[PDB]
Structure 1
């Protein structure tokens, strides 16, 4: 069943582990950079763009 009562990312702990280390250093990406992560964890550009779009939108504090 494709229905769920909580938001949930269709990704692995092995695969979010290296994604966390690029999100912590820059909050965005460029076309030239998308293709590096896409070759190094085997995802499409659509999936990477969206992942970096919505990780911003969960984290509303960054100023102290």
Structure 2
């Protein structure tokens, strides 16, 4: 059962399409936006 997970899919493509329309930004910003969220990772 335990082996691998959704390598950016479960919420990636799902939230990417919704985030675009929700935020009104282009996927081009999404790449950086998503990549930036994974880089820094929260604030704590």
Asked if the contact 1:27–1:56 (Cα under 8 Å) also holds between the matched residues in 2, the reply is no
Question: 5+ residue gaps in structure 1?
Answer: 1-19
Question: 5+ residue gaps in structure 2?
Answer: none
Question: When you count helix as a share of all residues, which structure comes out higher?
Answer: 2
TM-score, normalised with respect to structure 1? 0.37
Report how many residues are paired: 43
Q: List structure 1 runs of 4+ shifted beyond 2 angstroms.
A: 20-33
1:36 Cα deviation after fit: 1.0
